[PDB]
Design a protein around this motif. Structure first.
Motif, mmCIF file in Angstrom:
data_model
loop_
_atom_site.group_PDB
_atom_site.id
_atom_site.type_symbol
_atom_site.label_atom_id
_atom_site.label_comp_id
_atom_site.label_asym_id
_atom_site.label_seq_id
_atom_site.Cartn_x
_atom_site.Cartn_y
_atom_site.Cartn_z
ATOM 1 N N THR A 90 -12.633 -9.599 -19.962
ATOM 2 C CA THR A 90 -11.908 -10.710 -19.357
ATOM 3 C C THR A 90 -12.387 -12.015 -19.979
ATOM 4 O OG1 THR A 90 -13.543 -10.839 -17.539
ATOM 5 C CG2 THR A 90 -11.546 -9.535 -17.145
ATOM 6 N N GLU A 120 -17.662 -8.613 -16.940
ATOM 7 C CA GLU A 120 -16.952 -8.589 -18.218
ATOM 8 C C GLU A 120 -15.585 -7.930 -18.074
ATOM 9 O OE1 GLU A 120 -20.153 -8.033 -17.882
ATOM 10 O OE2 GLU A 120 -21.105 -9.418 -19.289
ATOM 11 N N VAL A 158 -4.235 -17.930 -11.161
ATOM 12 C CA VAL A 158 -4.006 -19.177 -11.906
ATOM 13 C C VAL A 158 -2.607 -19.240 -12.575
ATOM 14 C CG1 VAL A 158 -4.793 -20.587 -13.864
ATOM 15 C CG2 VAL A 158 -6.489 -19.562 -12.273
ATOM 16 N N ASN A 208 -16.570 -22.080 -14.429
ATOM 17 C CA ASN A 208 -17.183 -21.958 -13.130
ATOM 18 C C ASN A 208 -18.486 -21.170 -13.179
ATOM 19 O OD1 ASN A 208 -17.569 -22.422 -10.418
ATOM 20 N ND2 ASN A 208 -16.192 -20.756 -9.772
ATOM 21 N N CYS A 233 -15.061 -13.270 -18.636
ATOM 22 C CA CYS A 233 -15.999 -13.690 -17.591
ATOM 23 C C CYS A 233 -17.263 -12.861 -17.711
ATOM 24 C CB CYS A 233 -15.420 -13.486 -16.191
ATOM 25 S SG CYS A 233 -13.913 -14.395 -15.832
ATOM 26 N N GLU A 250 -8.819 -26.984 -18.622
ATOM 27 C CA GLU A 250 -9.609 -25.759 -18.535
ATOM 28 C C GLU A 250 -10.938 -26.079 -17.835
ATOM 29 O OE1 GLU A 250 -8.120 -23.115 -22.415
ATOM 30 O OE2 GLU A 250 -10.019 -24.243 -22.450
ATOM 31 N N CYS A 304 -17.465 -17.730 -14.784
ATOM 32 C CA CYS A 304 -16.063 -17.342 -14.699
ATOM 33 C C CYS A 304 -15.164 -18.183 -15.617
ATOM 34 C CB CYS A 304 -15.556 -17.414 -13.252
ATOM 35 S SG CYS A 304 -13.797 -17.036 -13.145
ATOM 36 N N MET A 305 -14.243 -17.517 -16.311
ATOM 37 C CA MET A 305 -13.363 -18.191 -17.261
ATOM 38 C C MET A 305 -11.895 -18.031 -16.921
ATOM 39 S SD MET A 305 -15.068 -17.769 -20.982
ATOM 40 C CE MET A 305 -16.820 -18.037 -21.221
ATOM 41 N N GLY A 306 -11.615 -17.787 -15.642
ATOM 42 C CA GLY A 306 -10.261 -17.534 -15.176
ATOM 43 C C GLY A 306 -9.238 -18.641 -15.410
ATOM 44 N N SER A 307 -9.700 -19.859 -15.701
ATOM 45 C CA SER A 307 -8.778 -20.955 -16.031
ATOM 46 C C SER A 307 -8.734 -21.290 -17.534
ATOM 47 C CB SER A 307 -9.094 -22.217 -15.240
ATOM 48 O OG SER A 307 -10.390 -22.713 -15.546
ATOM 49 N N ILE A 308 -9.459 -20.511 -18.338
ATOM 50 C CA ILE A 308 -9.394 -20.631 -19.798
ATOM 51 C C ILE A 308 -8.122 -19.928 -20.296
ATOM 52 C CG2 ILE A 308 -10.517 -20.065 -21.983
ATOM 53 C CD1 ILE A 308 -12.056 -22.121 -20.093
ATOM 54 N N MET A 309 -7.386 -20.580 -21.202
ATOM 55 C CA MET A 309 -6.118 -20.045 -21.728
ATOM 56 C C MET A 309 -6.265 -18.769 -22.571
ATOM 57 S SD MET A 309 -2.798 -21.728 -21.899
ATOM 58 C CE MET A 309 -2.078 -23.288 -21.387
ATOM 59 N N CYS A 311 -12.231 -10.157 -13.262
ATOM 60 C CA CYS A 311 -12.390 -11.538 -12.797
ATOM 61 C C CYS A 311 -12.017 -11.625 -11.325
ATOM 62 C CB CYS A 311 -11.544 -12.537 -13.594
ATOM 63 S SG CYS A 311 -11.610 -14.238 -12.885
ATOM 64 N N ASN A 314 -8.329 -9.622 -11.394
ATOM 65 C CA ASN A 314 -7.767 -9.656 -12.724
ATOM 66 C C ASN A 314 -8.543 -8.740 -13.657
ATOM 67 O OD1 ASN A 314 -6.000 -10.333 -14.706
ATOM 68 N ND2 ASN A 314 -7.030 -12.237 -15.294
#
Ligand code: HEM
Ligand code: HEM
Ligand code: P94
Ligand code: P94
Ligand code: H4B
Ligand code: H4B
Ligand code: ZN
Lengths: 413, 408
Positions: free
Chosen positions: A28, B30, A373, B389, A30, B386, A35-40, B33, A393
């Motif tokens: 993912t 990994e 998101v 977190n 992350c 972007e 957490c990278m859930g808002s990265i494109m 999410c 996700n």
């Protein structure tokens, strides 16, 4: 990871239990600590890399048709395995291709329209050799999918990648988009999102009309060759002029949009095979046009002009003049499409259908990957049911993936 | 690695190094999410957590490795040995509280973080003492409408059996009542807490906007009820600047959002009672409080008064009535000189704050799911920003509702 993960809907208090995540194949982006859930966005495959990926998918396929471990299954495995050994690749059967395409959509965590996943017309274009042929296949796709306004989702799949130097690519990001032109004075005419691609087309020889809503030509690459331009026959391009049920003046804004959203730059990955050209289409959610295409500042950016015509107090933000204009624009879009009998879905219906879809997937599949998101609509988020819905996700395969823009990698001949 | 984050409107790229400093888990892996999931002591554990906090405290005041830094560490170790715990200096307490706010990934209001009035109530022993500290907090923070950010910090946890707890989720909230016809009167989110207060002897006005009493627990004892003096409770009657009928809806809200059920963690110490307050972003009231299905749920009534087409959802009648409600809230507070911020101003400030934090601190943890406003998302700058977190300490943590743990 633990075997069960629970998600709650904080509005209805419904709890769902996810087991499907265990079948997650890729990263993912992350970690346990970030957490990278808002990265494109957080050179081919070898034989030994390909065997397990093919087997993984073939097993899944024969499981879906309730023939797992059967003679046909074991024979299919044997055939695929021998093919990889003697050709360094393999060919999917038509059934597997259709299954694979439908499941890549079913697996698209960012797609809110997935309740429709099983209804996808799959056009097998693996016999294509030239750009003229790609154009023929694409014209038929557009006509079938458009269907005089009663849109039907479809995908056209071009030959898979081989050595990476013979890729088929559609250079357009969607089959139908409007040109953007950068002016000497810094201003942009048309759709600022497409300025680069527009410039590339003009370089390959396109004569641009230099208007606000010029449908771009197709730029199509077959078999690793240089891409070629073709004009889409205008009768195949269904468009909707935007007007408003209450504001007579809204037509005077001169807005319109096309009916068919048809993404063409994604990569379809099935059992470790890579279909670098797989244009697919469904239909629009209103907000994609009314909020993003129209009201993004780096897009058509019409909020101000609409607000002025609404005679709103535009000097305080706390008047929410932007929010007011935004609702009306989205009303006009939905009104225009429904009046011209072109399929479109509002963001309330769509999110409600998705919640139903997701619940059904938890029950019949053990889960449904989803990217909150992306799933939550760009306006009125919390008054749609998905805002309140916990999501997990993760990446299942077959899948649709991003790929580098072809102009960045193409070796010109 | 250094991580980049991009704003897709402005193409501004910032580089995050701060995330390398975190040691607490996010809940993601990994492979999965969980960014949309709401919630994903001993002496032995205690000292290094304490040691870390002192280190960063003394590193923040540019005296890392000083005599005082060395001495303080000695002082803290010896104290954890001889008492199973330790006590924060005033300076550390104030620094700790400001930094919990600063590290709060979900807070869009963090540009204000260093302007926080800290009330040390660690000498409190009874619920009456709590009530007094809370009255002083409310009065200072309300400030006749010119709201000021504040936190009151009650004694830290010892053994879990002598907790200080504010049972109210906010110091000021409205009651919710279950009606005989199964409908809810007032705020449905508070029906359970309201019944607990009634059981305890509270006489309910049984109206739509009744200010709940404080329910205060000191040193592990049973909670006690207290009525906030009415003159300390600033309320705003909601009216619309164009629709003269909007006042007929009879809507009001309070001016002071003051969250009282979270846990403040500093250097391994746990403050189970740390009510804090700032001021409202309009959407909190106008979108969530008023228009959520499980809340006041006024969308339908308003759209009727607006004479909108409500037969199909594609008329966006919900969306229209939503904007109007939020215009009313902003207009009402402003007209009454009560501090409030609209979601455009607030998100802009946040983007600016982010940029400050990247420049001076090397990052800013941010929860996109929470930072993006519940209406008009993509027409605010944060939607396009972007964010990374991650969990930094000191922090505000959730804790179980006290009525699930308490033996009476
Ligand atoms: C049938 C009606 C459909 C609706 C209403 C719908 C709706 C949406 C929307 C609103 C998005 C967000 C994209 C954005 O905001 O730019 C999305 C994403 C996506 N959809 Fe669907 N979609 C539909 C059909 C399809 C089909 C037919 C496919 C493939 C066979 C598909 C695959 C995807 C993928 C891969 C994404 C992620 C795009 C990305 O990451 O950039 N969708 N969908
Ligand atoms: C000064 C004006 C402030 C504004 C405008 C503001 C705004 C917000 C908003 C809109 C949220 C989302 C909460 C929700 O939707 O329920 C939030 C969350 C939060 N805020 Fe701020 N805030 C302010 C002050 C403060 C202060 C003074 C503190 C602590 C000292 C604080 C700590 C937090 C924390 C811990 C959360 C997350 C709570 C949770 O996870 O449920 N904020 N803020
Ligand atoms: N910068 C940027 C940037 C912005 C958006 C995207 C993704 C856009 N994908 C849009 C997309 C994809 C599939 C769709 C299917 C149906 C539908 N109605 N819309 C659909 C829309 C990528 C880069
Ligand atoms: N169910 C539920 C459920 C709903 C919301 C929350 C989070 C509530 N936090 C609200 C909150 C916290 C701090 C704030 C600080 C300032 C401000 N204006 N609002 C603030 C609002 C938790 C559980
Ligand atoms: C920064 C953020 O990730 C980015 O703006 C995303 C947010 N959510 C989105 N959601 C949808 N449906 N489409 C988008 O383009 C985006 N953009
Ligand atoms: C499921 C989801 O995490 C939940 O509904 C969250 C979403 N984002 C939010 N954002 C804010 N500011 N406040 C909230 O209560 C929530 N709720
Ligand atoms: Zn994550």
């Amino acid at each position: 990871c633990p075997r069960f993960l629970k998600v709650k809907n904080w509005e209805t208090e419904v709890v769902l239990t996810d087991t499907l995540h265990l079948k997650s194949t890729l990263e993912t982006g992350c970690t346990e600590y970030i957490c990278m859930g808002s990265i494109m966005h957080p050179d081919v495959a070898t034989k030994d890399q390909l065997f397990p990926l093919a087997k993984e998918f073939i097993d899944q396929y024969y499981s879906s048709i309730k023939r797992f471990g059967s003679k046909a299954h074991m024979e299919r495995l044997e055939e695929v395995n021998k093919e990889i050994d003697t050709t360094s690749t393999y060919q999917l059967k038509d059934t597997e291709l259709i299954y694979g395409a439908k499941h890549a959509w079913r697996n698209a965590s960012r797609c809110v329209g997935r309740i429709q996943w099983s209804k996808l017309q799959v056009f097998d274009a693996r016999d294509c050799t030239t750009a003229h042929g790609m154009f023929n296949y694409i014209c038929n796709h557009v006509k079938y999918a458009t269907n005089k306004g009663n849109l039907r989702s479809a995908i056209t799949i071009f030959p898979q990648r081989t050595d990476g130097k013979h890729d088929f690519r559609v250079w357009n990001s969607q089959l139908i988009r409007y040109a953007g032109y950068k002016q000497p004075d810094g201003s942009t005419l048309g759709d600022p999102a497409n300025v680069q691609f527009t410039e590339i087309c003009i370089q390959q020889g396109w004569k641009p009309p230099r208007g606000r809503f010029d449908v771009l030509p197709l730029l199509l690459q077959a078999n690793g060759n240089d891409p070629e331009l073709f004009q889409i026959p205008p009768e195949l391009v269904l468009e909707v002029p935007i007007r408003h049920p209450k504001f007579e003046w809204f037509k005077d804004l001169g807005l319109k949009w096309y009916g068919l959203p048809a993404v063409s730059n994604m990569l379809l990955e099935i059992g470790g095979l890579e279909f670098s050209a797989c244009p697919f289409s469904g239909w629009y959610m209103g907000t994609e046009i009314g909020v993003r295409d129209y009201c993004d500042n780096s897009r058509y950016n019409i909020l101000e002009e609409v607000a002025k015509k609404m005679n709103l107090d535009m000097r305080k933000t706390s008047s929410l003049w932007k929010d007011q204009a935004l609702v009306e624009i989205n009303i006009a879009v939905l009104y225009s499409f429904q009046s011209d009998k072109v399929t479109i879905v509002d963001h309330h219906s769509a999110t409600e259908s998705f919640i139903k879809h997701m619940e059904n997937e938890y029950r019949c599949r053990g889960g449904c990957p989803a990217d909150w998101v992306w799933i939550v609509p760009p306006m009125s988020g919390s008054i749609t049911p998905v805002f309140h819905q916990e999501m997990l996700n993760y990446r299942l395969t077959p899948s649709f993936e991003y790929q580098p823009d072809p102009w960045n990698t193409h070796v010109w001949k």
